[PDB]
Symmetry: D2
Subunit: 115 residues, 4 copies
């Protein structure tokens, strides 16, 4: 599991469950090609997005549909989503955990890059 | 100004100065049209990106070039940028301050939205 | 002023107004002496807590009463407060802006430290 | 495991390993009584701090020695520590994860409160 997305709801202090997450790889022509997606689970985590073979170096965008999450909860959000764009380098072995800490008018996203 | 971007360096506890900021607006055909861009100043602020006439409703994307920032300070950061995509002025004109707090592997983007 | 506290409500995307802020300084005997306190204003800022004469080196604690804040808005928040403990003016006088970004279960405290 | 502290280093995008964490319970006289402590592990996590029986309602302070962590890395930090003070309520069953996302001049701390 080279890439795991973790989403936390900073309003309820809970994992942000059932949050749509799309991953995209930047194609040569600078457009985003859908690559992987899922919904975060009960634990706010989205595993099994990609695999080691698939997850090659490149520029990836993780788009977290924070807005539907806030809509589902009835809280007016500021952002359309949360959108983590980063270069997977893979110079040494890497797991990437992208943790998005979400508030209606603020989000934080952190990469915990290990191995 | 209706749109202000502020950027802090959470490593140096400083304003993040000379950070490139690009603002786009989603056009009718769902492309991003270049809307405005600028550098944060010596206070980490980027004022005057736009005006209350120009800053109509729409979805805007603010791409703060955090990578060049960290790179110029010798850091290889995780993200290519800090993004902020939001619907602006949906229930009439607002002032938006987008505050981006930057660390090499984490950033936070907050909006202070006030009713002028 | 050498010490400014700014507090944002990340739920409402607003300044967090009328937030009680208490500043303490660690005395010789390692107790916290009350140093200064105030409310954030209508801009979420608390200026004039102290002066450059009064704001000597030491360890200071800033306790931002985030709980009363969230409680007055009907929210049961997680933390009793947002704290900031820091050594101030160790290598001469600095201006400190403490920016506290508040959510009911998360807060972030950042310092913008500039050399006047 | 009613209370788990997770510390992330936002500069290196790694778990913050070997970070001293002290937990205190507010005593009746308003002083902090040491209750539990540990060092975060390799995964940035500090488990086994307390137990269900021990972790009664009360006001707790989690003090994270962020400053020694930054010193160990040679980066001048702003804060003396990170200090999470909160009321354990236990109205329904709760695990508390206190995640501290640490930068030299910024920290974020979030409670993920589940069950
Ligand atoms: C009411 C208010 C809220 C937030 C900010 N900016 C800000 C922020 F939103 C997060 C971290 C640091 C800073 Cl400086 C500011 C601008 C400032 O005075 O630094 C004002
Ligand atoms: C239940 C839970 C809550 C939060 C986190 N992690 C986390 C993190 F890894 C970075 C920044 C904030 C947070 Cl909250 C985690 C750990 C993770 O799976 O990365 C678990």
């Amino acid at each position: 599991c080279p890439l795991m997305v973790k989403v936390l709801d900073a309003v309820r202090g809970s994992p942000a469950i059932n949050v749509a997450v799309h991953v995209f790889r930047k194609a040569a022509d600078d457009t985003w090609e859908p690559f992987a997606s899922g919904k975060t689970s009960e634990s706010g985590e989205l595993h099994g997005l990609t695999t080691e073979e698939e997850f090659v170096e490149g520029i990836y965008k993780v788009e977290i549909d924070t807005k539907s999450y806030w809509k589902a909860l009835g809280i007016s959000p500021f952002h359309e989503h949360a959108e983590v764009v980063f270069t997977a380098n893979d110079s040494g072995p890497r797991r990437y955990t992208i943790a998005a800490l979400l508030s209606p008018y603020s989000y934080s996203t952190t990469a915990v890059v290990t191995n």
